[PDB]
């Protein structure tokens, strides 16, 4: 087992990683900004290193400072969590070059998945179903670009190869808007990623977001741990996630899961990963792969019993996966509601001091958060302050427990989305299940 690790993150996920480390007897190093001295995981960590001032550029994105922290404490590995540097291939490369273990895949694999065009090409080669598309970058020849759109058939969507997560894209419904749509996507990608490469896909009107969780070790084992539906979104940010995805049969699960696991073997994947699919009319279409552990990982843990963070750490130490595919079984159902410190009318972050706090409890209730009474949510970071995860023997029980748990949850002193989450739980289309990626913004606009 890894002797000591740097937790290169903050808030709920840093606490999540800390708990996993403690369970495995791994010593913890909490690197934190000057604004995060009183984070719960920092207070619980074996060692702490302040790596810079509040702004993320000088702290949680500060590569030299994070690596120096690992050096000075005699740590052997770095867990990047999600966000920040978790998908930064240059960071992973530096970590390994500096002699530390990066908890994640090889840097080359991170780089591959950050290149949406080359990632699609690899998955298609591996036998994973992808969206009908350009199968390559679009050039400057508008005759060729029109020809690609015709072959695919309108409507189409232009996407940035350096983008992802709903960022950097526009829908084209005919020839008249094609040139400008390509030009604008190119410009925005250049400004945001210094990478103007763009590609084209068939536009799917009302798909669901269904993603497959994988784990792969260094012994050549690769498994899939069912799927999650993450369709409930505002401005491409997930609000509610659940596992398994409603309407997905064991046959479909097996079909798509086996292809994801096979792809992992082909590409030499290692660690946790997520294959994102658009799912429409009974068909899966690969769009992107995330290499990090994700925000929504706990719903998968609830239905499989697999502790995914502990698996990441076991994998990094050189241990094989603790479970085989034939030992992975979907049981029950889990729902996650993201708790955000946000204004209900503007949806802008609403930081400040929590005055009263009470977490829900009970059978099937899981609370993932660093927050406590008297804790100040800083303005410098993401609005998500907690995750409420409820499990039941079926979806209806999971939702019932979520409703009860949300009513027990007290967070005073700051504005939160608890009331919105309650509304969603009570929404008759959500209760039916299988709402598409556009549902929430439509519901709120009505
Ligand atoms: N082929 C394809 N269709 C839609 C998509 C998307 O990724 C997407 C996601 C969110 C919103 C919108 Br509009 C499109 O990709
Ligand atoms: Cl994430």
Curated annotation (Swiss-Prot):
* Binding residue positions for Mn(2+) 2: 288, 290
Name listed for the protein in its UniProt record: Biotin carboxylase
GO-annotated cellular components: acetyl-CoA carboxylase complex; cytoplasm; cytosol
List of residues binding Mg(2+) 1: 276, 288
Q: Where is the active site?
A: 292
Q: Which reaction does it catalyse?
A: N(6)-biotinyl-L-lysyl-[protein] + hydrogencarbonate + ATP = N(6)-carboxybiotinyl-L-lysyl-[protein] + ADP + phosphate + H(+)
| Chain positions recorded as Mg(2+) 2 binding sites | 288, 290
Respond yes or no to whether keyword Magnesium is given for this record.
yes
GO biological process terms, semicolon-separated: fatty acid biosynthetic process; malonyl-CoA biosynthetic process; negative regulation of fatty acid biosynthetic process
**Effect after changing residue 296 to A:** Severe reduction in catalytic activity
């Amino acid at each position: 087992m890894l002797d000591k690790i740097v937790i290169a993150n903050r808030g709920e996920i840093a606490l999540r990683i800390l708990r996993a480390c403690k369970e495995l007897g791994i010593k913890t190093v909490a690197v934190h900004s000057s604004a995060d001295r009183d984070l719960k995981h920092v207070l619980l960590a074996d060692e702490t290193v302040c790596i810079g001032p509040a702004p993320s550029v000088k702290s949680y994105l500060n590569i030299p400072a994070i690596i120096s922290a690992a050096e000075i404490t005699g740590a052997v590995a770095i867990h990047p969590g999600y966000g920040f540097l978790s998908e930064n291939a240059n960071f992973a490369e530096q970590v390994e070059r500096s002699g530390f273990i990066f908890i994640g895949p090889k840097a080359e694999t991170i780089r591959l998945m950050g290149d949406k065009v080359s990632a699609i090409a690899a998955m298609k080669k591996a036998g994973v179903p992808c969206v009908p598309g350009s199968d390559g970058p679009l050039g400057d020849d508008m005759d060729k670009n029109r020809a690609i759109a015709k072959r695919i058939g309108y409507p189409v969507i232009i996407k940035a190869s350096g983008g992802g997560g709903g960022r950097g894209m526009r829908v084209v419904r005919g020839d008249a808007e094609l040139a400008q749509s390509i030009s604008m996507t190119r410009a925005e990608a250049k400004a945001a990623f210094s990478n103007d490469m763009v590609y084209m896909e068939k536009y799917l009107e009302n798909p669901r977001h269904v993603e497959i969780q994988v784990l792969a070790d260094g012994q050549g084992n690769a498994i899939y741990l069912a799927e999650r539906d993450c369709s409930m979104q505002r401005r491409h940010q997930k609000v509610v996630e659940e596992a398994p995805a409603p309407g997905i049969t064991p046959e479909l699960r097996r079909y798509i899961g086996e292809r994801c696991a096979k792809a992992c073997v082909d590409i030499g994947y290692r660690g946790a990963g997520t294959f994102e699919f658009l799912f429409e009319n009974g068909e899966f279409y690969f769009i992107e792969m995330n290499t990090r552990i994700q925000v929504e990982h706990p719903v998968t843990e609830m239905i499989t019993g697999v502790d995914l963070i502990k698996e990441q750490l076991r994998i990094a130490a050189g241990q094989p996966l603790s479970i085989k595919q034939e030992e992975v079984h979907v049981r029950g159902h889990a729902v996650e509601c993201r708790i955000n410190a946000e204004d209900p009318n503007t949806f802008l972050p609403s930081p400040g001091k929590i005055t009263r706090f009470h977490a829900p409890g009970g059978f099937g209730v899981r609370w993932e958060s660093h927050i406590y009474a008297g804790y100040t949510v800083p303005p410098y970071y993401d609005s998500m302050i907690g995750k409420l995860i409820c499990y039941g023997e079926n979806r209806d029980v999971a939702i019932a427990r979520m409703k009860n748990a949300l009513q027990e949850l007290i967070i005073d002193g700051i504005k939160t989305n608890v009331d919105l989450q309650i509304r969603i739980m009570n929404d008759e289309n959500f209760q039916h299940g299988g709402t598409n990626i556009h549902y929430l913004e439509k519901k709120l606009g009505l």
